Design a protein around this nucleic acid. Structure first.
Lengths: 142, 59, 176, 38, 209
RNA sequence: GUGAAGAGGGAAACAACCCAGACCGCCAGCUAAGGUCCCAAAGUCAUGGUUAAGUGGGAAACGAUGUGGGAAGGCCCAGAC
RNA sequence: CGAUGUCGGCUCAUCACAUCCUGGGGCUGAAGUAGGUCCCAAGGGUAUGGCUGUUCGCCAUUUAAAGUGGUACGCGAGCUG
RNA sequence: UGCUGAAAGCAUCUAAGCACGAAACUUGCCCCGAGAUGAGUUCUCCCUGACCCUUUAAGGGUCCUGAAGGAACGUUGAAGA
C-alpha cells in the first residue's frame, strides 16, 4: 500500500493579492511562480500542483534590469505572407501592461495544458481597481 | 517523489537536501530511510528539532 | 573634488532665498533666477555657499561640483550678466525684431518668425548684431545655438552667423 | 570620415581629448584630420 | 464625428461653366429617426442609435421588436449605433436631418459591394494570365509558382490566390459636396457610390479635415 | 587506442573524443566521467581572486583618467605637480 | 547507378545589401551648374528594343533607378524546346 | 548637429538637467477579427406544473405542460457551384 498519493480534486485553493509597485521583477517572478504551483509548501509529483488563486492589480509599475529600453522585439510567427513585426520593451509595456508579469513567470512554469491549468489560477490587471472583494483575497506585502 | 517531500521541508527550514541527508548519515542509526520519511509532513516543530540534531553531527 | 569644495562667495546688492529645496538668487538683472536639485542640498552660511548629498545618498562630490558650476555663474548672471557675441555677415543677411518676434533674413521663405523661451528676449541695435536680454547662462547658450542651425556657412562663401566661441572660415578657391 | 577603431595625430592644432566613450581627433580648417574613434 | 443613412435615387451630370459636366450622385436623406440617445455614459462611453427605415412585421421577431418600441411603433433592420466622443448632442430622442452636412466640404461613403460569386484568382486579384500563343495547355487562369521551389515545405497564409469577390463591406474615401437642401431631403455629391440594394450607403464627414 | 564482434553514463542529436564494461532481481545501498537558477533529480554550497562583456557562447591590428596586479625611477618642504 | 532531366529566355518572383534610385548625414585635390567620394535608414521602389538559342558580347532608346550577392550557376506532377 | 556641465584646480557632445534631429517608426486612414476556451461591452424577447429515486450538493424517472426562438413549405433575385 502506497505511503502517499497526489489527487487534484483533494487540492483546495483560496484567494491572495500581491503588490507589483516598485518591485524588482527578478524576485517577483520566482516567488509568484513558486506560489502559483505550491512550491513553497510540501511537494510530491510534478503532475499535480498545490498552489492557490492570485490577483495582480498594478502589473506594469514593476522595476527591471533592462537598461536599454529600445532593445527586444517580441516576435510571433503566424505564417501570414512570411512576415514578422517588432516592438521595443518601452512600446510593449504601453500596449500590453498586463502581459509582462505573465511572460516573466512563463520561464518558471511547464509548457502546454499543465502550464495552462496554472495560468487559470493567476489573474492580471494594471488599472489598480479591485473587483473580487466578495471572495476576500488575503493581502501579501512580500 | 520522497526526495521532493523531504527537500520541500529542508528548504522550509533553511537547510539543503544534500546537507540534511549527509548530517543524518554522519550520525549512527538516524537516516531511517525514505520509506519511513513521513516526518517531512507530520510536524514541522519536530522537523526543525531533527534539522538541529543533523547539524549536531554534520560539521 | 576641488570644484565642489569652492566657497563661491556671494557679491554685494544680492539677496539669497532657500526653503530646504530650490535655491533662489536676486539682483540687478533677470527675474525669479533659481535652480533645482532632488538629492543634492545647497545652503548659505552668511557670505559662503555649501553643496553636498542628502542623508541616505552620496555623490562623491561629483553632483555637488555640477550644482556649484551653475550657481557660481548665476551670481554673475544677476550682477553683470553676459556680453554681446552673436552676429551675422553677408549680402542680403540681416537681423531685426517686431514686438519680441525675430525677423531673421537668411534667403528663406520663412524668417524663423520665433519669440524664444521665458525670461529671454531678443533685441537688434544694428542689422548685424543680436543682443540677448536674460540672466541664465544655459538658455542664452541654447537659443544662440538654435539660431546657429539655420543656413550653416557655405564652404566657398563663409557667410552667415558668427558667435565668438569658434572662428567662421571660408574655403580657398582654385581659382579659375 | 573613415570608419575605424584607431586614430592618427598628424597636425599640432589637434587637442586629442576623449569624447563620448572614445579618443577623437579634429583640425580647425582641414576635414582630412576629423576621426570619430580611437 | 458620426454620420447619416439615406437612399440612392440615381446618377446624372450637372453641367458647369468650366465646360466639364461634373458627374453627380443623388441621395434622398430622410431625417434619421433616433431610437435612443445614450449621453449617460454607461460603461464609460456615449452613443446614439440614428435609425432609418423599418422591416415588414411578418419578419420582425420579439427580441428585435422591443429594441425599437421605446421610440415609436415601427421597428426592425437598421438601428445604426454610433459612438460620441469630443462633441455634445441634445440629451432627448430627436431625429437628425441632412442639414448636418450644410457646413461640410468633403465626405466619405461606405456600403456593400455587388455579388461576384466564385471569382477565381484572376477576377479576385486582377492577375496576369498565362499566354496561350506558342503552346501552353490545360491551365492559363492560374497565378503560377505558389511558393519558392523546394525548401519552403509549405504555402504562406493570406496570399493573392483563390477566394470569392464582392458581397462584402467597401469604402469610397473622398467625395465633394455640391448641394444640400433638408426641406427636400436632398444630398447632391460629386462622384459615384458602390453597390445597389445590398448597400446601406453610410455617409460621414471627412475626419482627416 | 575506439568500434566492427561491447550494451550503459557525459559530450544538445552524436560506432571515432571522456568514463566504464553490460547473467537476473531488490518493500537495498554507494560510486566513474559528468551534473545541482526555472524546466528535468541534486549545492540559488563555503571561501581566496577576476569581470559589464554577453567575453562566457567564431576573430587580428590599436588606444585610453574602465579596472585588477608588480618593480625601478624622476619631479619634491636646502619647496614639486 | 533496385533512378539525381540539360542551356538561355519566358513565367513567378523571393530574400538580402558589402545601397542602384529615393530619404537623411559628411567630403572633394567641389566656384554655381558639373565631374570624383565616404555611409546611416532595408521604410518606398529598382528597363525595353537590335543581332543571337545565348549566359558573355557589341549596338539603338529610356527611367528617380536598370547596381552587388544567394536560391538544383533559382523555377519542367511550370512554359518554350 | 549642439546647450549647460561633472567624474578630473585643467579639459570633454554625457554622467545628472536639456533643445533640435527622417521618407519611416508610434499615434493616424480602412477592411477583417472573442477558437482572445483570456470566450469581453451593452441592449432587446420569453418560460411561474407536481411527485419520486440514489454509498442523493450530482445524476436519473413518471404524469402533466410547451414560451421567446429555429427549421420545414413558397413566389423571386443587382445573392449563388
Amino acid at each position: 500500500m502506497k505511503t502517499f498519493t497526489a489527487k487534484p480534486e483533494t487540492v483546495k485553493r483560496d484567494w491572495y493579492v500581491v503588490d507589483a509597485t516598485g518591485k524588482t521583477l527578478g524576485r517577483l517572478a520566482t516567488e509568484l511562480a513558486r506560489r502559483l504551483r505550491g512550491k513553497h509548501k510540501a511537494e510530491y509529483t510534478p503532475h499535480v500542483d498545490t498552489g492557490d488563486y492570485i490577483i495582480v492589480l498594478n502589473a506594469d509599475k514593476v522595476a527591471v534590469t533592462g537598461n536599454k529600453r529600445t532593445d527586444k522585439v517580441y516576435y510571433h510567427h503566424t505564417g501570414h505572407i512570411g512576415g514578422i513585426k517588432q516592438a521595443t520593451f518601452e512600446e510593449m509595456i504601453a500596449r500590453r501592461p498586463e502581459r509582462v508579469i505573465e511572460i516573466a513567470v512563463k520561464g518558471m512554469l511547464p509548457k502546454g495544458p499543465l502550464g495552462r491549468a496554472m495560468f487559470r489560477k493567476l489573474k492580471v490587471y494594471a488599472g489598480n481597481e479591485h473587483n473580487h472583494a466578495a471572495q476576500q483575497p488575503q493581502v501579501l506585502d512580500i | 517523489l520522497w526526495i521532493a517531500r523531504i527537500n520541500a521541508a529542508a528548504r522550509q527550514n533553511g537547510i539543503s537536501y544534500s546537507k540534511f541527508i549527509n548530517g543524518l548519515k554522519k550520525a549512527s542509526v538516524e537516516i531511517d530511510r525514505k520509506i519511513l520519511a513521513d516526518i517531512a509532513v507530520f510536524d514541522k516543530v519536530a522537523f526543525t528539532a531533527l534539522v538541529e540534531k543533523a547539524k549536531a553531527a554534520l560539521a | 573634488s576641488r570644484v565642489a569644495k569652492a566657497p563661491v562667495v556671494v557679491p554685494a546688492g544680492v539677496d539669497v532665498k532657500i526653503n530646504g529645496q530650490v535655491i533662489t538668487i536676486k539682483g540687478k538683472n533677470g527675474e525669479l533666477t533659481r535652480t533645482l536639485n532632488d538629492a543634492v542640498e545647497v545652503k548659505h552660511a552668511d557670505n559662503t555657499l555649501t553643496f553636498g548629498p542628502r542623508d541616505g545618498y552620496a555623490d562623491g562630490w561629483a553632483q555637488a561640483g555640477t550644482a556649484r558650476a551653475l550657481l557660481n555663474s548665476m551670481v554673475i548672471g544677476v550682477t553683470e550678466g553676459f556680453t554681446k557675441k552673436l552676429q551675422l555677415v553677408g549680402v542680403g543677411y540681416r537681423a531685426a525684431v517686431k514686438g519680441n518676434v525675430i525677423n531673421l533674413s537668411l534667403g528663406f521663405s520663412h524668417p524663423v518668425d520665433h519669440q524664444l523661451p521665458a525670461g529671454i528676449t531678443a533685441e537688434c541695435p544694428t542689422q548685424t548684431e543680436i543682443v540677448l536680454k536674460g540672466a541664465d547662462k544655459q538658455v542664452i547658450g541654447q537659443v544662440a545655438a538654435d539660431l546657429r542651425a539655420y543656413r550653416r556657412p557655405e564652404p566657398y562663401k563663409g557667410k552667415g552667423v558668427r558667435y565668438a566661441d569658434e572662428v567662421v572660415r571660408t574655403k580657398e578657391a582654385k581659382k579659375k | 570620415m573613415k570608419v575605424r577603431a584607431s586614430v592618427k595625430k598628424l597636425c599640432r592644432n589637434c587637442k586629442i581629448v576623449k569624447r563620448d566613450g572614445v579618443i577623437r581627433v579634429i583640425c580647425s580648417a582641414e576635414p582630412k584630420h576629423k576621426q570619430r574613434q580611437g | 464625428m458620426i454620420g447619416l443613412v439615406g437612399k440612392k435615387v440615381g446618377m446624372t451630370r450637372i453641367f458647369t461653366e468650366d465646360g466639364v459636366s461634373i458627374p453627380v450622385t443623388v441621395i434622398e436623406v430622410e431625417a434619421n429617426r433616433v431610437t435612443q440617445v445614450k449621453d449617460l455614459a454607461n460603461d464609460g462611453y456615449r452613443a446614439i442609435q440614428v435609425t432609418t427605415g423599418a422591416k415588414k412585421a411578418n419578419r420582425v421577431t420579439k427580441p428585435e421588436a422591443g429594441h425599437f418600441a421605446k421610440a415609436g411603433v415601427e421597428a426592425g433592420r437598421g438601428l445604426w449605433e454610433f459612438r460620441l466622443a469630443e462633441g455634445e448632442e441634445f440629451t432627448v430622442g430627436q431625429s437628425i436631418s441632412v442639414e448636418l452636412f450644410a457646413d461640410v466640404k468633403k465626405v466619405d461613403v461606405t456600403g456593400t459591394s455587388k455579388g461576384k460569386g466564385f471569382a477565381g484568382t484572376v477576377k479576385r486579384w486582377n492577375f496576369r494570365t498565362q499566354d496561350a500563343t506558342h503552346g501552353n495547355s490545360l491551365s492559363h487562369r492560374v497565378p503560377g509558382s505558389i511558393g519558392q521551389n523546394q525548401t519552403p515545405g509549405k504555402v504562406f497564409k493570406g496570399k493573392k490566390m483563390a477566394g470569392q469577390m464582392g458581397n462584402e463591406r467597401v469604402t469610397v474615401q473622398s467625395l465633394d459636396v455640391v448641394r444640400v437642401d433638408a426641406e427636400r431631403n436632398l444630398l447632391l455629391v460629386k462622384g459615384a457610390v458602390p453597390g445597389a440594394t445590398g448597400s446601406d450607403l453610410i455617409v460621414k464627414p471627412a475626419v482627416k479635415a
